[PDB]
Enzyme design. Structure first.
Site, PDB file in Angstrom:
ATOM      1  N   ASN A  46      17.505   4.193  18.537  1.00 22.91           N
ATOM      2  CA  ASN A  46      18.068   3.869  17.234  1.00 22.91           C
ATOM      3  C   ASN A  46      18.947   2.632  17.379  1.00 22.91           C
ATOM      4  O   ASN A  46      19.369   2.287  18.487  1.00 22.91           O
ATOM      5  CB  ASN A  46      18.920   5.024  16.718  1.00 22.91           C
ATOM      6  CG  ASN A  46      18.143   6.310  16.614  1.00 22.91           C
ATOM      7  OD1 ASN A  46      17.121   6.361  15.951  1.00 22.91           O
ATOM      8  ND2 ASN A  46      18.620   7.355  17.274  1.00 22.91           N
ATOM      9  N   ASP A  48      21.985   2.101  16.738  1.00 21.26           N
ATOM     10  CA  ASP A  48      23.325   2.373  17.228  1.00 21.26           C
ATOM     11  C   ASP A  48      23.327   2.611  18.744  1.00 21.26           C
ATOM     12  O   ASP A  48      24.365   2.908  19.335  1.00 21.26           O
ATOM     13  CB  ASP A  48      23.923   3.573  16.484  1.00 21.26           C
ATOM     14  CG  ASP A  48      23.220   4.875  16.812  1.00 21.26           C
ATOM     15  OD1 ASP A  48      22.247   4.855  17.595  1.00 21.26           O
ATOM     16  OD2 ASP A  48      23.623   5.925  16.284  1.00 21.26           O
ATOM     17  N   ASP A  52      16.338   8.987  20.211  1.00 22.29           N
ATOM     18  CA  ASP A  52      15.711  10.173  19.650  1.00 22.29           C
ATOM     19  C   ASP A  52      14.660  10.760  20.595  1.00 22.29           C
ATOM     20  O   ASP A  52      13.846  10.030  21.157  1.00 22.29           O
ATOM     21  CB  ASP A  52      15.070   9.833  18.309  1.00 22.29           C
ATOM     22  CG  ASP A  52      16.092   9.713  17.194  1.00 22.29           C
ATOM     23  OD1 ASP A  52      17.282  10.030  17.382  1.00 22.29           O
ATOM     24  OD2 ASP A  52      15.693   9.335  16.097  1.00 22.29           O
ATOM     25  N   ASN A  59      18.526  13.316  17.917  1.00 18.28           N
ATOM     26  CA  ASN A  59      19.379  12.193  18.274  1.00 18.28           C
ATOM     27  C   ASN A  59      20.369  12.533  19.377  1.00 18.28           C
ATOM     28  O   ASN A  59      20.973  13.615  19.376  1.00 18.28           O
ATOM     29  CB  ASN A  59      20.160  11.748  17.031  1.00 18.28           C
ATOM     30  CG  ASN A  59      20.544  10.302  17.083  1.00 18.28           C
ATOM     31  OD1 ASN A  59      20.435   9.669  18.128  1.00 18.28           O
ATOM     32  ND2 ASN A  59      21.008   9.758  15.957  1.00 18.28           N
ATOM     33  N   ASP A 101      23.591  21.899   9.447  1.00 16.66           N
ATOM     34  CA  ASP A 101      24.784  21.056   9.520  1.00 16.66           C
ATOM     35  C   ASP A 101      25.403  20.634   8.175  1.00 16.66           C
ATOM     36  O   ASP A 101      26.501  20.092   8.152  1.00 16.66           O
ATOM     37  CB  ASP A 101      24.474  19.821  10.385  1.00 16.66           C
ATOM     38  CG  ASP A 101      25.590  18.800  10.385  1.00 16.66           C
ATOM     39  OD1 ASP A 101      26.600  19.022  11.093  1.00 16.66           O
ATOM     40  OD2 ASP A 101      25.446  17.772   9.685  1.00 16.66           O
TER      41      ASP A 101
HETATM   42 CL    CL Z   1      18.469  14.345  14.790  1.00 15.84          CL
HETATM   43 CL    CL Z   2      21.648  13.704  13.211  1.00 17.54          CL
HETATM   44 EU    EU Z   3      15.106   7.351  14.908  1.00 19.88          EU
HETATM   45 EU    EU Z   4      28.219  16.655  10.406  1.00 21.76          EU
END
Ligand code: CL
Ligand code: CL
Ligand code: EU
Ligand code: EU
Ligand code: CL
Ligand code: CL
Ligand code: CL
Ligand code: CL
Ligand code: CL
Ligand code: CL
Ligand code: CL
Ligand code: CL
Ligand code: CL
Ligand code: CL
Ligand code: CL
Ligand code: CL
Ligand code: NA
Length: 128
Positions: A46, A48, A52, A59, A101
Site C-alpha cells: 500500500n 503508506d 496486504d 493489512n 471493527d
Molecule cells: Cl485489511
Molecule cells: Cl484495515
Molecule cells: Eu491494498
Molecule cells: Eu478502528
C-alpha cells in the site's frame, strides 16, 4: 494456493463467514476475488508502506506483523506470512476481527467499490 470459486466458498462457510456480521457468503467470495483473485499467496504494497497479505488482503498496518511497517499494530496476533497459507483459517479468523471493527466490510475498499450493492449471490452460483 489458488482456490476455485466454489472451493473457497465452501471453505469460508465451514469457518463461519456465511452471514458473519450479517454479510452473506457471496460478499466474502466477491471480496476475495477482487482482493486476491482467490490466491492465498497474494501480497501487495500500500502507499503508506504497509503490506496486504493473502486471500483477503489483510493489512500489516493494523492486523499482522511483518516487521517492516513502522508504527503498526498486530491486532490478530499473527505473523503476516501466516496469512499466505493454503489453509485459510488464520485469514478468516483475522477477517472476523476486521469486519467487527466498526465499518463492516467497508474496511475492504475493493468490497465497497466493486461488491457492495451488487448481486453478490452470483459469486456462489452453482456451488453446493
Ligand atoms: Cl485489511
Ligand atoms: Cl484495515
Ligand atoms: Eu491494498
Ligand atoms: Eu478502528
Ligand atoms: Cl471466478
Ligand atoms: Cl512492523
Ligand atoms: Cl523489504
Ligand atoms: Cl513514520
Ligand atoms: Cl498490537
Ligand atoms: Cl510475528
Ligand atoms: Cl481451508
Ligand atoms: Cl455492517
Ligand atoms: Cl483492508
Ligand atoms: Cl449485480
Ligand atoms: Cl453481476
Ligand atoms: Cl450471497
Ligand atoms: Na503490524
Amino acid at each position: 494456493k489458488v482456490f476455485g470459486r466454489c472451493e473457497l466458498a465452501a471453505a469460508m462457510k465451514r469457518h463461519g463467514l456465511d452471514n458473519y456480521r450479517g454479510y452473506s457468503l457471496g460478499n466474502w467470495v466477491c471480496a476475495a476475488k477482487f482482493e486476491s483473485n482467490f490466491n492465498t499467496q497474494a501480497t501487495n504494497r500500500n502507499t503508506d508502506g504497509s503490506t496486504d497479505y493473502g486471500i483477503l488482503q489483510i493489512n500489516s498496518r493494523w492486523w499482522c506483523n511483518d516487521g517492516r511497517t513502522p508504527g503498526s499494530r498486530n491486532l490478530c496476533n499473527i505473523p503476516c506470512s501466516a496469512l499466505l497459507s493454503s489453509d485459510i483459517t488464520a485469514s478468516v479468523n483475522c477477517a472476523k476481527k476486521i469486519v467487527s471493527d466498526g465499518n463492516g466490510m467497508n474496511a475492504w475498499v475493493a468490497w465497497r467499490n466493486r461488491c457492495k450493492g451488487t448481486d453478490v449471490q452470483a459469486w456462489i452460483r452453482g456451488c453446493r
